[PDB]
C-alpha cells in the first residue's frame, strides 16, 4: 500500500507533463491569432480613416464646384432626408424622397432677419414654401436656385 | 531527503517536490490561457465593429454619390495623388479629369468613344473643351455651368 501509491506518483507526474505540453501548444496558437488580429485591426483602421480624408476632399470638391453641400441623411420609416446648404459665400433646406417623388422644404430655423429679406429679394416667392416634384425635375430645381443666388 | 513508511530516498523526495512544481507550472499556464482567450474575444469584437461601421459609412457615401448624380448630373469616379497634384475622373456624356496643384487643370478623356458620339459631342461642345486648360479654382463652378448648359 505504501509502495504502490508512491510508484503511482510517477504515473501522475507523467500525465501532468503531457497535459502541460498540450497546453504549451494551445498557448502558442493563441499568440499567433492575436498577432494576426493586430495587423488586420491596424490596416482596417487606416483604410476606414484615410477613407474619411478622401470623402472630405470630394465633399470639399463638390462645394467648390457646385456651391452646394449635403450635411446629413436620415430615414424616418418612410423617406430619407438630406439637409442642404446651397449658395455662394446661402439657403438651407431639406429634401425628402418617398415611381419616385421629391419634397422641398425651406429651413430657416435660425436666420438674422437682415438676411431673410436679402433672400426674399433674390428668391421667387415659392422657394419659401414646401413643394413636390418628380425626380426628373430636380436638376432643374437646383439650377433655378443657383441662378437666383 | 523524504522517506516513506510501510506498516510500520533522494529520488523519492524528488517525486513529491516535482509533482508539486508541475501542478503549479500547469495552473499558472491555465491563467495565461484564459487571459489570452479574453484578449482574443475583445480583439474580435473590434474587427467586427470596424467592419460594420465601414460597411455602413460606405453605404452613406454611396447614397450621396447617387444623390449628386440625380441632382447635378455629375459623378466623381476616383482620386489619385501623383506626388504633385491630385486627380479626379469625372462623368458629366463627357468624361474628363481635373488636376489640382491654388490652380486647376482640365483634361478631356475620350480613351474610348464610338465616333458617332465624338461628333455628336463636337456639335454641342465649344472647341476648347477638347483641349487641356488651366484656370483658378474661383472659375471652376463657372466652368461646370458652361458644360452643363451645352449638354
From Swiss-Prot, chain A:
GO annotation terms (biological process): attachment of mitotic spindle microtubules to kinetochore; homologous chromosome segregation; meiotic chromosome segregation; meiotic sister chromatid cohesion, centromeric; meiotic sister chromatid segregation; protein localization to nucleolar rDNA repeats; rDNA chromatin condensation; spindle attachment to meiosis I kinetochore
Keywords: Centromere, Chromosome, Coiled coil, Meiosis, Nucleus
Coiled coil: 15-54
CDD domains found in the cross-reference section: RWD_CSM1 (cd23787)
Gene3D superfamilies: 1.20.5.340, 3.90.1150.80
Superkingdom classification of source: Eukaryota
Chief location category: nucleus
Molecular function as annotated in GO: identical protein binding; microtubule site clamp
Compartment(s) of residence: Nucleus, Nucleolus; Chromosome, Centromere
Annotated Gene Ontology cellular component terms: chromosome, centromeric core domain; mitotic spindle; monopolin complex; nuclear envelope; nucleolus
This protein's record includes keyword Nucleus: yes
PANTHER family xrefs: MONOPOLIN COMPLEX SUBUNIT CSM1 (PTHR28006:SF1)
Known function: Component of the monopolin complex which promotes monoorientation during meiosis I, required for chromosome segregation during meiosis. Also plays a mitotic role in DNA replication.
Additional free-text comment from the UniProt record: Present with 1920 molecules/cell in log phase SD medium.
Record note on quaternary structure: Component of the monopolin complex composed of at least CSM1, LRS4 and MAM1. The complex associates with the kinetochore. Interacts with CDC46, CDC47, GIC1, GIC2, MCM3 and NUR1.
Protein name per its UniProtKB record: Monopolin complex subunit CSM1
Source organism of this protein record: Saccharomyces cerevisiae (strain ATCC 204508 / S288c)
Lineage of producing organism: Eukaryota, Fungi, Dikarya, Ascomycota, Saccharomycotina
Amino acid at each position: 500500500s505504501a509502495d504502490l501509491l508512491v510508484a503511482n506518483l510517477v504515473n501522475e507526474n507523467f500525465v501532468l507533463s503531457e497535459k502541460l505540453d498540450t497546453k504549451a501548444t494551445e498557448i502558442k496558437q493563441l499568440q499567433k491569432q492575436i498577432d494576426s488580429l493586430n495587423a488586420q485591426v491596424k490596416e482596417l483602421k487606416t483604410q476606414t480613416s484615410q477613407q474619411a480624408e478622401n470623402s472630405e476632399v470630394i465633399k470639399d470638391l463638390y462645394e467648390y464646384l457646385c456651391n452646394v453641400r449635403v450635411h446629413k441623411s436620415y430615414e424616418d420609416d418612410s423617406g430619407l432626408w438630406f439637409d442642404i446648404s446651397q449658395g455662394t459665400h446661402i439657403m438651407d433646406y431639406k429634401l425628402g424622397f418617398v415611381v419616385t417623388e421629391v419634397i422641398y422644404a425651406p429651413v430657416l430655423k435660425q436666420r438674422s432677419t437682415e438676411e431673410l429679406y436679402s433672400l426674399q429679394s433674390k428668391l421667387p416667392e415659392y422657394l419659401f414654401e414646401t413643394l413636390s416634384f418628380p425626380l426628373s425635375s430636380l436638376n432643374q430645381f437646383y439650377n433655378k436656385i443657383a441662378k437666383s443666388l
